[PDB]
Design a protein around this ligand. Structure first.
Ligand SMILES: [Cl-]
Ligand SMILES: [O-]
Length: 150
């Protein structure tokens, strides 16, 4: 299975991998001051990275099925979408674009939230095009979707 990472970027099992250079996740980057859940209509907004906001600190954006969004998180996360837990699916109607995430296969994916609450990824590539939803979450851990810029 795809490895999890701790808040100092150390892998908790398996072997570590680098994120795609064009992902909205850029490492190394610190996180884990506080676990902070956010509503999707209340995602962290420009300048929140430096200062935090009324909800707490901001290390970027994390998400897991539910959907549950977080603006900071301290426990194990995915640095890449664990594609064994995703299933090929039709393009949904999307509520929001949330980032560009590295897949388990090393490829770049656009990540969206669908109106049905599903987290969906679609290959960034022009040729070869997969569309998937995050349907199992066996270790109950979010993907780190985007990191704050500094
Ligand atoms: Cl997995
Ligand atoms: O920001």
């Amino acid at each position: 299975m795809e490895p999890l990472y701790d808040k100092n970027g150390a892998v908790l099992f398996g072997e570590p991998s680098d994120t795609h250079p064009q992902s909205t996740l850029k490492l190394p980057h610190p996180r884990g001051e506080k676990e902070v859940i956010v509503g999707i209509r209340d995602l962290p907004r420009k300048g929140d990275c430096r200062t935090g906001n009324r909800l707490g600190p901001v290390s970027g954006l994390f998400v897991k099925p539910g959907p549950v969004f977080y603006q900071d998180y301290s426990g194990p996360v995915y640095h890449r979408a664990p594609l064994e837990q995703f299933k090929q699916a039709p393009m949904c109607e999307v509520t929001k674009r949330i980032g560009r995430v590295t897949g388990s296969d090393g490829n770049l994916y656009h990540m969206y939230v669908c109106t049905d609450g599903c987290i969906l990824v679609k290959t960034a590539k022009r040729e070869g095009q997969d569309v998937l939803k995050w349907v199992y979450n066996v270790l109950d851990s979010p993907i780190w979707v985007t990191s704050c810029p500094v």
